[PDB]
Design a protein around this ligand. Structure first.
Ligand SMILES: Nc1ncnc2c1ncn2[C@@H]1O[C@H](COP(=O)(O)OP(=O)(O)OP(=O)(O)O)[C@@H](O)[C@H]1O
Ligand SMILES: [Cl-]
Length: 420
């Protein structure tokens, strides 16, 4: 099925990665990214479009006029806005869950209730709308009830003391419901799968670093780096997770008459008691996408097309084994607070020539130059035989790329390396 045109929604590194990867398919003549960035502007197959992504009527008309085969959604917002359901009733295929099914991410209360209803393991919890009753619960639990979550996508506060959790319940009920749950401990890992509603095809597990500074210090951010596969997870554990979380989530959704299709993301804590779910999401994470998709050997276009057709098992994904992908984000001075914009970037061509992938996040074209246009500017991904080697190879690319006030971490993966 040659000469397909495909559309991706979004404008960060995740969307560059999806575009790059799709463009490799022999089935694909054109990838359009809406609105895209400087990394996707100007390629043999990839280009940007200013089509509105929030007016679903106009988006559908644009899809049919250009004969777009299907739409791929990068970020979570359009999913929760109904993009899939609306494109479908207009006769346009879109990869992703419906708004109803994205409730696994969009409402934390729904997710926790859904999990209790189907014996999916997760931290014990309770929801509140009055803050006084929330304090009562914090103050009188014998387990550490110290994690407070704004139900509607601060958002999440992990307190160390009852005092801090009461303080937190106060801040989140300023500017619905909140969920207070047990503080678990152990290792966090991201477990994704492709799913068509019935079949489940897990991705190899990833980990990322949210903290701004080396050593895991400073403020949290959207993610300063990631790598895949996380060596902390045995094969047994992955099949426990596939059975106990992924297949069980999809089956549960299907059995409640709200089938789940696209990507299911589960954030998981490895406890002494086993795997527990911290949160669901409905799309690739950023910068994890930048380390999972480079590991995919199959044609992504085939995987997606077969997922839309409900024939996921006819085209199971095949992964690169014995390779580790690791990615390191370059960010603008001041991130995650106020940062500078419009700063000229050099060296990303030589970084790629060294055999690395450069995935653009906040970049833009300006007067024949590429300039910073966002907090996270780009990521360099290396694919090698182990973490340590991938890290050091990525760092050569990082040293070639220069912009005024660039920051990045030189220790991505340090814990996985210490685990081994
Ligand atoms: N139920 C849970 N048990 C334990 N950890 C959790 C739970 N749910 C979420 N988390 C994790 O807590 C992490 C964030 O907590 P962290 O220890 O970084 O403190 P923080 O709230 O981020 O503090 P800061 O004010 O510095 O941002 C997230 O990575 C999130 O996945
Ligand atoms: Cl919908």
């Amino acid at each position: 099925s040659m000469a397909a045109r495909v559309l991706i929604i979004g404008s960060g590194g995740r969307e560059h990665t999806l575009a790059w990867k799709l463009a490799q398919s022999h089935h694909v003549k054109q990838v359009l990214v809406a609105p895209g960035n400087a990394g996707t502007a100007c390629s043999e197959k990839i280009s940007n479009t200013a089509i509105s992504i929030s007016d679903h009527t106009a988006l559908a008309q644009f899809c049919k006029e250009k004969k777009i085969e299907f739409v791929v959604v990068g970020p979570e917002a359009p999913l929760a806005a109904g993009i899939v359901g609306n494109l479908r009733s207009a006769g346009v295929q879109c990869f992703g869950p419906t708004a109803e099914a994205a409730q696994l991410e969009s409402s934390k209360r729904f997710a926790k209730e859904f999990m209790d209803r189907h014996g999916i393991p997760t931290a014990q919890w309770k929801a509140f709308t009055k803050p006084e009753e929330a304090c009562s619960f914090i103050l009188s639990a014998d387990f550490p009830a110290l994690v407070v979550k704004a139900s509607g996508l601060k958002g999440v506060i992990v307190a160390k003391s009852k005092e801090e959790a009461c303080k937190a319940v106060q801040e989140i009920m300023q500017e619905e419901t909140i969920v207070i749950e047990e503080l678990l401990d152990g290792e966090e890992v991201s477990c994704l799968c492709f799913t068509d509603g019935k079949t489940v095809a897990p991705m190899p597990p990833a980990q990322d670093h949210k903290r701004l500074l080396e050593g895991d210090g400073g403020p949290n951010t959207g993610g300063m780096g990631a790598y895949c596969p996380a060596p902390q997870v045995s094969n047994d554990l992955l099949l426990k997770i596939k059975d106990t979380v992924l297949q069980r989530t999809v089956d549960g959704m299907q059995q409640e008459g709200t089938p789940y299709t696209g990507i299911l993301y589960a954030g998981i804590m490895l406890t002494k008691n086993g795997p527990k779910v911290l949160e669901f999401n409905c799309r690739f994470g950023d910068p994890e996408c930048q380390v999972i998709l480079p590991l995919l050997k199959s044609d992504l276009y085939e995987v997606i097309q077969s997922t839309l057709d409900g024939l996921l098992c006819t085209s199971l994904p095949v992964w690169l084994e014995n390779h580790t992908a690791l990615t390191v984000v370059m960010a603008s001075k001041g991130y995650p607070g106020d940062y500078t914009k419009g700063v000229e970037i050099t060296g990303f061509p030589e970084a790629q020539a060294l055999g690395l992938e450069v995935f653009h996040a906040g970049t833009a074209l300006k007067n024949g130059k590429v300039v910073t246009h966002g907090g996270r500017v780009l990521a360099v991904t290396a694919i090698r035989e182990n973490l340590i080697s991938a890290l050091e190879e990525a760092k050569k690319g990082l040293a070639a790329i220069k912009f005024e006030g660039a920051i990045y971490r030189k220790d991505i993966g340090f814990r996985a390396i210490a685990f081994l």
